[PDB]
Design a protein around this ligand. Structure first.
Ligand SMILES: CS(=O)(=O)c1cccc(OCCCC(=O)N[C@@H]2C[C@H]3C[C@H]3C2=O)c1
Ligand SMILES: CS(=O)(=O)c1cccc(OCCCC(=O)N[C@@H]2C[C@H]3C[C@H]3C2=O)c1
Lengths: 162, 162
């Protein structure tokens, strides 16, 4: 947590965070941040190792308005697990199908709501045999990740805009 | 007991669930405060806790919201602030600390709250300890529990405050 905080560059900060996430057992992750009063998701500060095809697909498809975790983040400060039950609409079912093709099935999204009104998330994806395995690997790290999502948000909001 | 918080039907039962939890963790006095979007008028905020009534009342007539070093910290960070002496720097802040100690609030930490609806607040927790070192170690050993709690309190507490 110290290294993150003390990091002076976007590039080095992302590497510190990326590795931490990896050490915890997370394959692909995404740190997204928007500033105050903004909802232009596609022109947000993005960091992570999410598949490049997945992400440009997502942007062109207008998937911010379809991803069930994006609206959750506007409504809560609590984590949302990528359970099948959140994919409810016709498109959300297609979204899930396409997300799984890109290798993102299991995981959780932790909403970010910064002191200067910034809105974002730290999503983390785990590779597990089944959902019960993924919840087990996600719960064992859950208290560490909670402290991490606010350190990431406090340091990451400095570098994103300031 | 985090989930019974969520499930609390009203303000009165919710406050009691929170008071007990904080107490079980080892906290003498606590305060949960929450303001709504686009507001910075601290006298008409949603307040819960067991802070001395004379202290609370003294603090408002004195306009201590603009003097409390933890109140401005909350407007700048999502990270906890410990009630170390170095926190009080101004002349008014030195008097504030002196008066806070008289009311029995000398050791403790404040956790900022920044909700999904733009709500600004905090969960401050105080410790009756013999010295700062003893205080800092107790606070450190419960810190990961509290990190989850402060968001658990903010998510449920915002849904009843307004
Ligand atoms: C733009 S921003 O950075 O300002 C911002 C603000 C608010 C929410 C936010 O999105 C968080 C959730 C995004 C996400 O992980 N999607 C993956 C992709 C697929 C596996 C399924 C997921 O849940 C982004
Ligand atoms: C009004 S609100 O509820 O909307 C709100 C919004 C932002 C900050 C906030 O204050 C958090 C810090 C208050 C506090 O614990 N003070 C004690 C009192 C004395 C021991 C020294 C302290 O630190 C309150």
């Amino acid at each position: 947590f110290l290294e993150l905080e003390r990091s002076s560059g976007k590039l080095e900060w992302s590497a510190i965070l990326q590795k931490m996430a990896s050490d915890l057992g997370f394959s692909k992750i995404l740190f997204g941040l928007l500033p105050k009063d903004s909802q232009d998701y596609e022109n947000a500060f993005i960091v992570g190792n999410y598949p490049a095809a997945w992400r440009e697909h997502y942007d062109r498809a207008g998937y911010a308005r379809v991803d069930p975790t994006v609206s959750h983040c506007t409504q809560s400060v609590l984590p949302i697990f990528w359970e099948p039950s959140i994919y409810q609409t016709r498109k959300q079912h297609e979204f899930f199908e396409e997300a799984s093709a890109a290798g993102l099935v299991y995981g959780l999204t932790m909403p970010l709501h910064g002191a200067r009104g910034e809105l974002g998330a730290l999503s983390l994806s785990v590779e597990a045999e089944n959902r019960a395995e993924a919840n087990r690997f996600m719960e064992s790290v859950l208290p560490t990740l909670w402290m991490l999502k606010d350190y990431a948000l406090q340091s990451g909001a400095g570098l994103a805009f300031e």
